[PDB]
Amino acid sequence: HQIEKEMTQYFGIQRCIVVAGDSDIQKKVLSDFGDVLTNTLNLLLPNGENTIAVMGGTTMAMVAENMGSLETEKRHNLFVPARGGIGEAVSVQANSISAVMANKTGGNYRALYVPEQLSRETYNSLLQEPSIQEVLTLISHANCVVHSIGRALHMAARRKMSDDEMVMLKQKNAVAESFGYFFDEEGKVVYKIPRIGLQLKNLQEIPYVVAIAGGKTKAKAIRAYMKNAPKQTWLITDEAAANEILK
């Protein structure tokens, strides 16, 4: 509680949940993040039709695998990726996280059928597809977003970004990534990839925003991204990250 209070005040956000342990060294912590996200969305998501836009990555893949039921007679949740064209592998791409979350929670998903790596030709063509437009529109009306925060250079390498981009990110001292934006330690956006889906500016208007990121290794990235995160953000993290941030 005390540490959670200190974290919320440090960032000026709504709520921080600090899970026992260190997700760098303890696999159960990521499973615990699943439990916590389930409880958090059960509390936050109203009855009716909700659209939850999600990012991928290793944290989110594990969170998704460890979710519990959210669907009811009166509450129907749809999961969609927050972005296309991110460059992840299938095991951790946002489409995959959406499908798993839908399965584990009793909800539904709609994949955005945009390759994770794609060409200008493919992009223009897909934008004229009513099916693609339909999913982009669903994403634009999301009332919930769930994401992790990446360590910038690690993300750039994993996503097989171009040599020029990697070198550019190093020299602009990129620290954090989120939604395909890269942030330096001052919280400044130093680079962004071409956008397919959510705009950073529009996060501010989404009622339910949940960032999930843990481990001492992520303390710097968490600090850099959270500087300009929407004030309504709930941060799910662990003791290892919190202790490092608050030292």
Automatic annotation (TrEMBL):
Domain Sugar-binding: start-end pairs: 1-247
Q: A Gene Ontology MF term for this entry?
A: DNA binding
Q: Does Transcription regulation appear among the keywords?
A: yes
Q: Which family does it belong to?
A: Belongs to the SorC transcriptional regulatory family.
Question: What name does this protein carry?
Answer: Transcriptional regulator, SorC family
Going by the UniProt record, its keywords in alphabetical order are: DNA-binding, Transcription, Transcription regulation
- Kindly list the organism's lineage: Bacteria, Bacillati, Bacillota, Bacilli, Lactobacillales
Q: What is the native source organism of this protein?
A: Enterococcus faecalis (strain ATCC 700802 / V583)
Q: Which domain of life is it from?
A: Bacteria
